[PDB]
Design a protein around this ligand. Structure first.
Ligand code: CLA
Ligand code: CLA
Ligand code: CLA
Ligand code: CLA
Ligand code: CLA
Ligand code: CLA
Ligand code: CLA
Ligand code: CLA
Ligand SMILES: CCCCCCCCCCCCCCCC(=O)OC[C@H](COP(=O)(O)OC[C@@H](O)CO)OC(=O)CCCCCCCCCCCCCCC
Ligand SMILES: CC1=C(/C=C/C(C)=C/C=C/C(C)=C/C=C/C=C(C)/C=C/C=C(C)/C=C/C2=C(C)CCCC2(C)C)C(C)(C)CCC1
Ligand code: SF4
Ligand code: SF4
Ligand code: SF4
Lengths: 733, 37, 80, 138, 75, 141, 68, 30, 39
C-alpha cells in the first residue's frame, strides 16, 4: 500500500506479489512514477556514488581484516610456508573439534585461510606492515565517506546536473580516457617507481621519506633532457631476492619481458614501464573529442561519415541511438567489461604479476574461476541489455537502414547459422567424446579419435615455444620477427623466450589432444549461449508466434496457451536459458583449467593428457578422484580444516536441487496448494486470531523462473567454489 | 572462540548484534514499513 | 485491472465473448464487417487474464488482446 | 436476493473470510424441475423448485455455475442473474447487465475497449518514453 | 489379448535364452562357484569383452534376474 | 616439425601397448593387423595414434579422405531428400505423402543421388537451389 | 483482385507474411478488410496440442501484392 | 600486531560513512 | 494388398527399414574390416 512507492500499480494489489515485485522493480528507474529523463539520470548518478562507496567499504573491510585478524606480519617472512589468514572465525556453534581443526596457519583463534590473494597483492605493491594496511583501511573509509557525500550532494537541487551534462559524450570520453584511464595509470606507475620497486629492492619509502628519497640516483633532469637510458641502466639481476637488497639494480623502468626468477612473477620495473606506456597512450587518446575549445572530433561526424554500399545508411543516426539509450550504453559497457574480465582471468594465471602467487595454487585457482564467472555474468548481462534496448529504447524510424536496422532485417539468417554451428560443433564434440568413451570402455584405447590441436600449437610456436618442432616466427631465431632486422629492438625477447620455454610456469601451457576437444566444447558453449542471447535480443521485438512483444515488455510471463502454447517467449526467458548455458560453459572451462593445472602443479601431466579424451576419464580422475579429500572433511572419526568446504559442497547441492523445484514445478500446483493452506489457517482455532494483511499467493511465473535461476546459480557457484578450493588446498597446502 | 588479536571482546558483542539485532531490527522496521498505510 | 482491446480485424465471430469465463466481453453493433458486430470489453475490471478470448480468436494475428497489468482482488481470482 | 437456498450439505470449499469482509457473489436462477447440479465449490446439490439463491466467493464460480446451468441441462435455465453483494449491504447486478446475454448484439451497447487500428499500427515504446503510459493505451 | 501375446513373446524369449544361449546346463551342476549367464554378445566393435568369464568356460553377460534360481525351484 | 610426436614404429610406449591389443572381431589376428595398421601413424608419449587435420597431404588420409567421403554421402542424403520434397509439392496433397512415403518415387530419387554435385551446380547456376529473400515467408523485422 | 488470384502478403503481422495465397473472395459491402485470402500453410492458432490452426484470413486490398 | 585502540578508532571513523550513507540513501528515497 | 503396401510405406516402417539397412552395412563393414581409425 505504501512500500512500492515508486509504482502506484503495485501499491494496490492486496497480495504478497507487491512485496516481491517491489523488491524487483526498485532499481528499474525507467518504470517509476513521475520519472522524467533528467530525474532518471540524476538518480542513476547518485546510485553510482553509493555503489562506489560500497566498493570502497568492501576493500576497506578486506584491508581491515587482513590488518586486524590476519597474519600479514608473519606471512611476509616466508610467504611460501605460511598460509595467509583472511579473518577470524567467531561463531558460538563450534565444538571443540572444529575449534582445534580451524586453528591453522599459526594462530590461536580459529581462522579462515585467505584464497582471494590480497596478501600477495599487498606484498607486491609495497605494503609490509599492519600499520600500512590500517592506514589504507582508514583512508578508504574516508574515501567512501567522500563518495557518499558526493552522491548526497548531487541529489541537492543546486548541484543536480542538467540533462545536457549527462548527454555530453565527448567530454566524458576525454576525461575518462585521459583523466581516469591515463592519469590513474600514470599515478600507479608513480607508486610503482616510488614505493613498490624500492621496497621490493629493500628500502622503506613511506610517506615520510617519500620526498627525501628519489627513486633513482639520477634525478628528473635525465627525464627532461631526453637521455632516458639511465632509467634502464642496470636491471634487476636474475639472483634478486624480493623485499631485500641483493643485486637490486636501481633501474626504475626496464623491459626484460620475462619472469622474476624468485617470485615467479613479472618484474615490478616491467610493470611500471608498462603503466607508463599505457598512461602515455591513454592520455593522448583523451585529446580526441571536441569540447569547449576548437580542436578534436565530433562523434556524430565520425559515425555519420561511415556509409558504404554494402550497408547503405551505414552508421547514420547512431550517435543519438547510443546517447539517448541507457540500455545500449549499459550493454556496451557490460560487453567490454566481460571481455576484459575474461582477459584478466586468462592473463593473471599465465602472466602472474604478484609475488609468490604462482606458487600459491589455491588462490590462483580461485582468482581464475572468480573472474571467469564474473566475465560470463557480465557478457550475459550485456546481451540482456541488448534485448532490453531492442524492447524499450529502439526506434526503427531514426534507425532506418543503418547497421541496427540491418541486424533486425536478417536476424533469421544469423540465428539459423548460429543454430547450425552450435548443432554441428555439439554433435561432433559429443560424438568424439562418446566414441572415445565407448572404445576405451571396450578395452581398446588405441581406437580413440585423438586430434592434434595443431593450430594452437602453431600459435604457441609463433610466440616462441619451440617444443613442437615448428620454426616459424619466434621459434626460428633467423626469422624476420625474432631478429627484428631494422632495429633489433627485441629487448623483451631473451627473457620472454627463457620464460615461455621453461616447463614450470603456466605461461603457454603444453596443449595436446585432450585440449582440442575441450576447446571445441568451450566453443560450443560460447556459441549456444550466444545463440540464446541473440535469439532473445533480436526476437525481443517479436517473432511470428507473437508479432507484438514490445508492448508486453521485457519480462512478461507468457502469452497464454493459445497459438500452440507460448510458455517462455519473452526475451527475459532467453536470458534465463542462456544463464543456464553460461553456467554450463563456465563449468566446462573451469573444470578444464582446474584439471589441467592439477596435472601441471603436481607434475603428473600424463593423467590429464591420457585421461581427458573420454568422459569417464573426466568423471573418475577428476570428479571422483579429487573429491576424496573433500567429502572426508568431516567423517565420524573427526574434523579437519576442509570441513566448512564439505559443508558448503552439500549446501550447494541442496540449493541446486531447490532450484530444480522452482524450475520444474509451476505456479498452478502451488497456487491451489496455498489455497488449501489458507483454508487451514482461516478455519482453525487459536490461529484465526492472526490474519494476513497481504493475501498469500504463489510466486509469479517469471518471478519463480528468476528464483529457480538464482538457486541454480548460487548452489552451482557454492558447490564449485567448495570443490575447487578444497581440492587444491587438499593437496597443495 | 578465544581471541588472540586486539579487542577480542568486539566480535563477542558484534556477532550477536549483526546476527540478531541487525536482522530483528531490520526485519521489524521493514515489516512495519512494507505494511504501513 | 487488465485491459482487453479489440482491433479492427474483428470479424464478429462471437468466439471470444463465449470463450470468456467471466463474460467481460460483449458484442456491440458495428459497420466494418459482414457479421455487423464487433466485440467490446465493458466490464474489463473483471478480467482475470486467462486469455481464453485470445485463444478463440480466428483472425490472424489477433483481433483481441489482453494486456496484463495492475492486479486487484477481481483480477487475481482470490476467494480469500 | 429472494430465493430459498439449494439443499446442499455444506462443504469446506466455499466462502472464506473474503465474503464477509469484501464482496461475495450471489447467483439466482429459477427452474421448474428439481434436479442435481455440480457446485463449482465441489460436490453436488439439489435445485429447488422455483427460485434458488447460491452465495459464492468468486465471480468465476458464479459464471461457471451459470455456464453449466445453460449447457448441462436439457430444459436450459437461462434466466439466471448474478449479483455482487457487499457486507455493508448493497447489491450490485453484474452478468446479464443488459437484457440479453453478451454473445447476442443488443444494439444499445457501447463499443468500449475498441481500438481504431490493428496491432501493426500500435505505437512503439521508444516514442512514449518516460510518459507514464504504455504502448497499448496511447 | 495383444498385450498377453507380447508378454508370452517376452517369456518365450527368456526361456529360449535359458535353453540355448546360457550355461544353465553348467550352472545346475555347480551353483556355488560359477554364475548365471543367459546372453552372449556378438563380437563386432570390440564388445566381445562383455563376454566376461562367468564360469565353466562359458563366456557371456552375467544375468541378474533370478531366472536360473526360478528354473531350479520349478524343477 | 612435429617433434612432440614420434611415429609409432620407433616408440617405446606404443610397442608396450601393441604387445597386448585385443581382438575386436572373431578373428584372432585382428589385434595384430590393427597394430600393423596403426604403426604408420603419429602417436604421442601415451602410445595412442593421433590424427593431423592441417590438410597436409602427408596426413591427408587422417581427415581429408573421410571429409570428402562424408561430404559426398551426406550431400547424397540432403539432395535426395530435397528433390523428393520438391517433387511432392505438386501432388494436391503434399502433407500426406510425408506420412506415407511414395516408395517408387522415393527409390527413383534415392538412385538420383549419384550426380548430386553436378545437380547442385546446375540448380545453383539456374537459380533453383536458393530462393529470393522476398519470396520466402519471414518474421516481423 | 478476383477469385483464384495468388497474392503475396505484406501485413507485417500475419503468419503468412511474405507467403503466397489464393484469394477466395472479395467483398463489396464497404468493409475494412474485404478480401478473404486462404493459404496452403496453417498458422499458430488454437489451444495447445491442437493438430492444426487456420488457413484463412481477411486482408485489405492494399496489403496484397498480386503475383498472378 | 595491531593496537586495541586502533580498532575502536577505525570504528568511530567508520561511523562517518554510516551517517553519510544513511543520509545519501534517505535522499535517494526522495 | 495395398493396405500392407500403404503400411509398409509409412514413415516409421520405412525409417526403421532404412536404419536397419544402414546399421547392417555398417556392422558388416566392421565385421570384415574391423578397425579403421584413418585411411
Ligand atoms: C578526469 C576527470 C574524471 C575522473 C577521474 C572521473 C572519474 C569517474 N567518473 Mg566521471 N566525469 C567526468 C570527469 C571525470 N570522471 C566528466 C567531465 C564528466 C562529464 C561529461 C563525467 C561524468 C560522469 C558520469 C555521468 C559518471 C561518471 C562516473 C565516474 C566514475 C567511473 C569510474 C569508476 O567508477 O570505475 C573506476 C574505473 C577505473 C579506475 C578504471 C577502469 C578500470 C580499467 C578498465 C582498468 C582495469 C583495472 C586494471 C586491469 C587493474 C586493476 C586491478 C587492481 C584494482 C587490483 C569515476 C569515479 C560514474 C560514477 O561512478 O558516478 C559516481 C558516472 O555515473 N562520470
Ligand atoms: C553494470 C551492471 C548492471 C546494471 C546497472 C544493471 C541494471 C539494470 N538491470 Mg541488469 N544485468 C546485469 C548487470 C547490470 N544490470 C547483469 C550482469 C545481468 C546478468 C545476470 C543482468 C540481467 C538483467 C535482467 C535479465 C534484467 C535486468 C534489469 C535491470 C534493471 C532493473 C534492475 C533490477 O530489477 O534489479 C533490482 C534488484 C533485484 C531484482 C534483486 C535480485 C538480484 C540478486 C538476485 C540479489 C543480489 C543482492 C545481494 C545482496 C548482492 C536495471 C536497469 C531488469 C529490467 O527490467 O531491465 C529494464 C531485467 O529484467 N538485468
Ligand atoms: C546433456 C544435456 C544437454 C544436451 C545434449 C543438449 C543439447 C542441445 N541443446 Mg541444450 N540445454 C540443456 C541441456 C542439454 N542440451 C539444458 C539443461 C538447458 C537449459 C534450460 C538447455 C537449453 C537449451 C537452449 C535454450 C538451446 C539448447 C540447444 C541445444 C542444441 C545445442 C546444439 C548442440 O550442442 O549440438 C547438438 C549436440 C548434441 C549433443 C545433441 C544431443 C543429441 C545426441 C547426439 C543424440 C541424438 C541422436 C538420436 C536422436 C538419439 C542441442 C540439441 C540450442 C539449440 O537447439 O540450437 C539449435 C538452444 O537454443 N539447449
Ligand atoms: C563490506 C565490507 C566488510 C565485510 C564483508 C565485513 C565482514 C565482517 N565483519 Mg567487518 N568491518 C568492515 C567491513 C566489512 N566487514 C569495516 C570497513 C570495518 C572497519 C570499521 C569493519 C570492522 C569490523 C569489526 C570491528 C568486526 C568485524 C566483523 C565482521 C565479521 C562479522 C560481521 C559483523 O560482526 O559485522 C560487524 C560490522 C561492523 C562493526 C561494521 C561493518 C560495516 C560495513 C562497512 C558495512 C558494509 C555495507 C555493505 C557493503 C552493504 C565479518 C567477517 C567482526 C569480526 O571479525 O568477528 C570475528 C568484528 O568484530 N568488522
Ligand atoms: C548469525 C547469528 C547467530 C548467532 C550469534 C547465534 C548464536 C547462538 N545460537 Mg544460533 N542460529 C542462527 C544464527 C545465530 N546463532 C541461525 C540462522 C540458525 C538457524 C539455522 C540458528 C540455529 C540455532 C539453534 C537451533 C540453536 C542455536 C543456539 C545458539 C546459541 C548457543 C548457546 C546458547 O545456549 O545460547 C542461548 C541463547 C542466547 C544467548 C540468546 C540470547 C538470549 C539472552 C537472554 C540474551 C538477551 C539479554 C536480554 C534478555 C536482552 C538484552 C537487550 C539488549 C539491548 C541489552 C548461540 C548464542 C542454540 C540455543 O541454545 O539457542 C537458544 C540452539 O539450540 N542456534
Ligand atoms: C524378450 C524378447 C526378446 C529379446 C529382447 C531378444 C533379444 C535377443 N535375441 Mg532373441 N528370441 C526371442 C525373443 C527375444 N530375443 C524369442 C521369443 C526367440 C524364439 C524365436 C528368440 C530366438 C533367438 C535366436 C535364435 C537368436 C536370438 C538372439 C538375440 C539377440 C540378438 C538378436 C538380433 O540381433 O536379431 C536381429 C538378442 C540378445 C541371437 C543371439 O543371442 O545370438 C547369439 C540368436 O541367435 N534370439
Ligand atoms: C532432406 C531434407 C533436409 C535437408 C536437405 C536439410 C538441409 C538443411 N538443414 Mg535440416 N532438417 C531436416 C531435413 C533437411 N535438412 C529435418 C528432417 C530436420 C529435423 C530434425 C532438420 C532440422 C534442422 C536443424 C535444426 C537445422 C537444419 C539446418 C539445415 C542446413 C544445414 C545442413 C544441416 O545442418 O543438416 C542438419 C540436419 C539435421 C540436424 C537432421 C537431418 C535429418 C536427416 C538426416 C535428413 C534427411 C531427412 C529425410 C530422411 C530425407 C527424406 C529422404 C527421401 C527419400 C524421403 C540445410 C539448409 C541448420 C540450419 O539452420 O542451417 C543454416 C539447422 O540449424 N536442419
Ligand atoms: C559423431 C562422431 C563420430 C565420429 C567422427 C566417428 C568416427 C568413427 N568411429 Mg565412432 N562412435 C561414435 C561417434 C563417432 N565415431 C559414437 C557416438 C559411438 C558410440 C556408439 C561410436 C562408437 C564406435 C565404435 C565402437 C567403433 C567406432 C569406429 C569408428 C571409425 C570407423 C567407423 C567405420 O565403420 O569405419 C571412425 C573413426 C570403429 C573403429 O574402427 O574405430 C577406430 C569402432 O570400432 N565408433
Ligand atoms: C573465424 C572466427 C570468427 C568468426 C565469426 C563469425 C562471424 C560470421 C561471419 C559472417 C560474414 C558476415 C557478412 C558481413 C556483412 C556485410 O555485408 O559486411 C560488408 C562489409 C562492408 O560494409 P561497408 O563498409 O559497406 O559498411 C559501411 C559501414 O557499415 C561500415 O563501414 O564488409 C565486411 O565484410 C566487413 C565485416 C567484417 C566483420 C564481420
Ligand atoms: C550493446 C548492444 C549490443 C551488443 C552487445 C554484444 C553483442 C556484445 C558482444 C560483442 C563482443 C563481446 C565482441 C567481441 C569482440 C571481439 C573482438 C574485438 C576480437 C578481435 C580481437 C582482435 C582484433 C585481436 C587481434 C590480435 C590477435 C588475436 C593476436 C595479436 C594481434 C592482434 C592484437 C591483432 C546488441 C548488439 C546486442 C544490441 C544493442 C545493444
Ligand atoms: S503453462 Fe504457464 S507459461 Fe506456459 S502458456 Fe500456460 S500460463 Fe503461460
Ligand atoms: S474472437 Fe476475435 S474475431 Fe471473433 S468476435 Fe472476438 S475479437 Fe472478433
Ligand atoms: S482474459 Fe479471460 S477473462 Fe479477460 S476478457 Fe479475455 S477471456 Fe475474458
Amino acid at each position: 500500500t505504501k512500500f512500492p512507492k515508486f509504482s502506484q500499480d503495485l501499491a494496490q494489489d492486496p497480495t504478497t506479489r507487491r512485496i516481491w515485485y517491489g523488491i524487483a522493480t526498485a532499481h528499474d528507474f525507467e518504470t517509476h512514477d513521475g520519472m522524467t529523463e533528467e530525474n532518471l539520470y540524476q538518480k542513476i548518478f547518485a546510485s553510482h556514488f553509493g555503489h562506489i562507496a560500497i566498493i570502497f567499504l568492501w576493500t576497506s573491510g578486506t584491508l581491515f581484516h587482513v590488518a586486524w585478524q590476519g597474519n600479514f606480519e608473519q606471512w611476509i617472512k616466508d610467504p611460501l610456508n605460511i598460509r595467509p589468514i583472511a579473518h577470524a572465525i567467531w561463531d558460538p556453534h563450534f565444538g571443540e573439534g572444529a575449534v582445534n581443526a580451524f586453528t591453522q596457519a599459526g594462530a590461536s583463534n580459529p581462522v579462515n585461510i585467505a584464497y582471494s590473494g590480497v596478501y600477495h597483492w599487498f606484498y607486491t605493491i609495497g605494503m609490509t606492515t599492519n600499520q600500512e594496511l590500517y592506514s589504507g583501511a582508514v583512508f578508504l573509509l574516508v574515501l567512501a565517506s567522500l563518495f557518499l557525500f558526493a552522491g548526497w550532494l548531487h541529489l541537492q537541487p543546486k548541484f543536480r546536473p542538467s540533462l545536457a551534462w549527462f548527454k555530453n559524450a565527448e567530454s566524458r570520453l576525454n576525461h575518462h580516457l585521459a583523466g581516469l584511464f591515463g592519469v590513474s595509470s600514470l599515478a600507479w606507475a608513480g607508486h610503482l617507481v616510488h614505493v613498490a620497486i624500492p621496497e621490493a629492492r629493500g628500502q622503506h619509502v613511506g610517506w615520510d621519506n617519500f620526498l627525501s628519497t628519489p627513486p633513482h640516483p639520477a634525478g628528473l633532469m635525465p627525464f627532461f633532457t631526453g637521455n632516458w637510458g639511465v632509467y634502464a641502466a642496470d636491471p634487476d639481476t636474475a639472483g634478486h631476492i624480493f623485499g631485500t637488497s641483493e643485486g637490486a639494480g636501481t633501474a626504475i623502468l626496464t623491459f626484460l619481458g620475462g619472469f622474476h626468477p624468485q617470485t615467479e612473477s613479472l618484474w615490478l620495473t616491467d610493470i611500471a614501464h608498462h603503466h607508463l606506456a599505457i598512461a602515455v597512450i591513454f592520455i593522448i587518446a583523451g585529446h580526441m573529442y571536441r569540447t569547449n575549445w576548437g580542436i578534436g572530433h565530433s562523434i556524430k561526424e565520425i559515425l555519420n561519415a561511415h556509409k558504404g554500399p554494402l550497408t547503405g545508411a551505414g552508421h547514420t543516426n547512431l550517435y543519438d541511438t547510443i546517447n539517448n539509450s541507457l540500455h545500449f550504453q549499459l550493454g556496451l559497457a557490460l560487453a567490454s567489461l566481460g571481455v576484459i574480465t575474461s582477459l584478466v582471468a586468462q592473463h593473471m594465471y599465465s602472466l602472474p604479476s604478484y609475488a609468490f602467487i604462482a606458487q600459491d595454487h589455491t588462490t590462483q585457482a580461485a582468482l581464475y574461476t572468480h573472474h571467469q564467472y564474473i566475465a560470463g555474468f557480465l557478457m550475459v548481462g550485456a546481451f540482456a541489455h541488448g534485448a532490453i534496448f531492442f524492447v524499450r529504447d529502439y526506434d526503427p524510424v531514426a534507425n532506418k537502414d543503418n547497421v541496427l536496422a540491418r541486424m533486425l532485417e536478417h536476424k533469421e539468417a544469423l540465428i539459423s547459422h548460429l543454430s547450425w554451428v552450435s548443432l554441428f560443433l555439439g554433435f561432433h564434440t559429443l560424438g568424439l567424446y562418446v566414441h572415445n568413451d565407448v572404445v576405451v570402455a571396450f578395452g581398446t584405447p588405441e581406437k580413440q579419435i585423438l586430434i592434434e590441436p595443431v593450430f594452437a600449437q602453431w600459435i604457441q610456436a609463433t610466440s616462441g615455444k619451440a617444443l613442437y618442432g615448428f620454426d616459424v616466427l619466434l621459434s626460428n631465431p633467423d626469422s624476420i620477427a625474432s631478429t627484428a632486422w631494422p632495429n633489433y629492438g627485441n629487448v623483451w625477447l631473451p627473457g620472454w623466450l627463457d620464460a615461455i620455454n621453461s616447463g614450470t610456469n603456466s605461461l603457454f601451457l603444453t596443449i595436446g589432444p585432450g585440449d582440442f576437444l575441450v576447446h571445441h566444447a568451450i566453443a560450443l558453449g560460447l556459441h549456444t549461449t550466444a545463440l540464446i542471447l541473440i535469439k532473445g535480443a533480436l526476437d525481443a521485438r517479436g517473432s511470428k508466434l507473437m508479432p507484438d512483444k514490445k508492448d508486453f515488455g521485457y519480462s512478461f510471463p507468457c502469452d497464454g496457451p493459445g497459438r500452440g502454447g507460448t510458455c517462455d517467449i519473452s526475451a527475459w526467458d532467453a536470458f534465463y536459458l542462456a544463464m543456464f548455458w553460461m553456467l554450463n560453459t563456465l563449468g566446462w572451462l573451469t573444470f578444464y583449467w582446474h584439471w589441467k593445472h592439477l596435472g601441471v602443479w603436481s607434475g603428473n601431466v600424463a593423467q590429464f593428457n591420457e585421461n581427458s579424451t573420454y568422459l569417464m576419464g573426466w568423471f573418475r580422475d577428476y570428479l571422483w578422484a579429487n573429491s576424496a579429500q573433500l567429502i572426508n572433511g568431516y567423517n565420524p572419526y573427526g574434523v579437519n580444516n576442509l570441513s566448512v568446504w564439505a559443508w558448503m559442497f552439500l549446501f550447494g547441492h541442496l540449493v541446486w536441487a531447490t532450484g530444480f523445484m522452482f524450475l520444474i514445478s509451476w505456479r498452478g500446483y502451488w497456487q491451489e496448494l496455498i489455497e488449501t493452506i489458507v483454508w487451514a489457517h482461516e478455519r482453525t482455532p487459536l490461529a484465526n486470531l492472526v490474519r494476513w494483511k497481504d493475501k498469500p499467493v504463489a510466486l509469479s511465473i517469471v518471478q519463480a523462473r528468476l528464483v529457480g535461476l538464482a538457486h541454480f546459480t548460487v548452489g552451482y557457484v557454492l558447490t564449485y567454489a567448495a570443490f575447487l578450493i578444497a581440492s587444491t588446498a587438499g593437496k597443495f597446502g | 572462540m578465544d581471541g588472540s588479536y586486539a579487542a577480542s571482546y568486539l566480535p563477542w558483542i558484534l556477532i550477536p548484534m549483526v546476527g540478531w539485532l541487525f536482522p530483528a531490527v531490520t526485519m521489524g522496521l521493514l515489516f512495519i514499513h512494507i505494511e504501513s498505510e | 485491472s487488465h485491459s482487453v482491446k479489440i482491433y479492427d480485424t474483428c470479424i464478429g465471430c462471437t468466439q471470444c465473448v463465449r470463450a470468456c469465463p467471466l463474460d467481460v466481453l460483449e458484442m456491440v453493433p458495428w459497420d466494418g464487417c459482414k457479421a455487423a458486430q464487433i466485440a467490446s470489453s465493458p466490464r474489463t475490471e473483471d478480467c482475470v487474464g486467462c486469455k481464453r478470448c485470445e485463444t478463440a480468436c480466428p483472425t490472424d494475428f489477433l483481433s483481441i488482446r489482453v494486456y496484463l497489468g495492475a492486479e486487484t482482488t477481481r483480477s487475481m481470482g482470490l476467494a480469500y | 436476493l429472494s430465493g430459498q437456498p439449494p439443499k446442499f450439505g455444506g462443504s469446506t470449499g466455499g466462502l472464506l473470510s473474503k465474503a464477509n469482509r469484501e464482496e461475495k457473489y450471489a447467483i439466482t436462477w429459477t427452474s421448474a424441475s428439481e434436479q442435481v447440479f455440480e457446485m463449482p465449490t465441489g460436490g453436488a446439490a439439489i435445485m429447488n423448485e422455483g427460485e434458488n439463491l447460491l452465495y459464492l466467493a468468486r465471480k468465476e464460480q458464479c459464471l461457471a455455475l451459470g455456464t453449466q446451468l445453460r449447457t448441462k441441462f436439457k430444459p436450459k435455465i437461462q434466466d439466471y442473474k448474478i449479483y455482487r453483494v457487499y457486507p455493508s449491504g448493497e447489491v450490485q447486478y453484474l452478468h446479464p447487465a443488459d437484457g440479453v446475454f453478451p454473445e447476442k448484439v443488443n444494439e444499445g451497447r457501447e463499443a468500449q475497449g475498441t481500438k481504431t487500428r490493428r496491432i501493426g499500427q500500435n505505437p512503439e515504446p521508444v516514442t512514449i518514453k518516460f510518459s507514464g503510459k504504455a504502448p497499448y493505451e496511447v | 489379448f495383444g498385450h498377453l501375446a507380447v508378454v508370452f513373446v517376452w517369456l518365450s524369449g527368456m526361456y529360449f535364452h535359458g535353453a540355448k544361449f546360457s550355461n544353465y546346463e553348467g550352472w545346475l551342476a555347480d551353483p556355488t562357484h560359477i554364475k548365471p549367464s543367459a546372453q552372449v554378445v556378438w563380437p563386432i566393435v570390440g564388445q566381445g569383452i562383455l563376454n566376461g568369464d562367468v564360469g565353466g568356460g562359458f563366456h557371456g553377460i552375467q544375468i541378474t534376474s533370478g531366472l536360473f534360481y526360478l528354473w531350479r525351484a520349478s524343477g | 616439425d612435429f617433434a612432440n610426436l614420434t611415429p609409432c614404429s620407433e616408440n617405446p610406449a606404443y610397442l608396450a601397448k601393441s604387445k597386448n591389443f585385443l581382438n575386436t572381431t572373431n578373428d584372432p589376428n585382428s589385434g595384430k593387423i590393427r597394430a600393423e595398421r596403426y604403426a604408420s601413424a603419429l602417436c604421442g608419449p601415451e602410445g595412442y595414434p593421433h590424427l593431423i587435420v592441417d590438410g597436409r597431404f602427408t596426413h591427408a588420409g587422417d581427415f581429408l579422405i573421410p571429409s570428402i567421403l562424408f561430404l559426398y554421402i551426406a550431400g547424397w542424403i540432403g539432395w535426395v531428400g530435397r528433390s523428393y520434397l520438391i517433387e511432392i509439392r505438386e501432388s494436391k496433397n503434399p502433407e500426406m505423402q510425408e506420412v506415407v512415403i511414395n516408395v517408387p518415387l522415393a527409390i527413383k530419387k534415392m538412385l538420383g543421388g549419384f550426380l548430386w554435385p553436378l545437380a547442385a551446380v546446375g540448380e545453383y547456376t539456374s537459380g533453383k537451389l536458393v530462393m529470393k529473400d522476398s519470396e520466402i515467408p519471414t518474421s516481423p523485422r | 483482385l478476383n477469385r483464384g488470384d495468388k497474392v503475396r502478403i505484406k501485413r507485417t503481422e500475419s503468419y503468412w507474411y511474405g507467403d503466397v495465397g489464393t484469394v477466395a473472395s472479395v467483398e463489396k459491402s464497404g468493409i475494412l478488410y474485404p478480401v478473404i485470402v486462404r493459404f496452403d500453410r496453417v498458422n499458430y492458432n488454437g489451444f495447445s496440442g491442437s493438430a492444426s490452426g487456420v488457413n484463412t484470413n481477411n486482408f485489405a486490398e492494399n496489403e496484397l501484392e498480386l503475383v498472378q | 600486531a595491531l593496537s586495541d585502540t586502533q580498532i575502536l578508532a577505525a570504528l568511530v571513523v567508520a561511523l562517518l560513512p554510516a551517517f553519510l550513507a544513511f543520509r545519501l540513501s534517505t535522499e535517494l528515497y526522495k | 494388398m495395398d493396405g500392407l503396401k500403404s503400411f509398409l510405406s509409412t514413415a516409421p516402417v520405412m525409417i526403421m527399414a532404412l536404419l536397419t539397412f544402414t546399421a547392417g552395412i555398417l556392422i558388416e563393414f566392421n565385421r570384415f574390416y574391423p578397425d579403421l581409425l584413418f585411411h
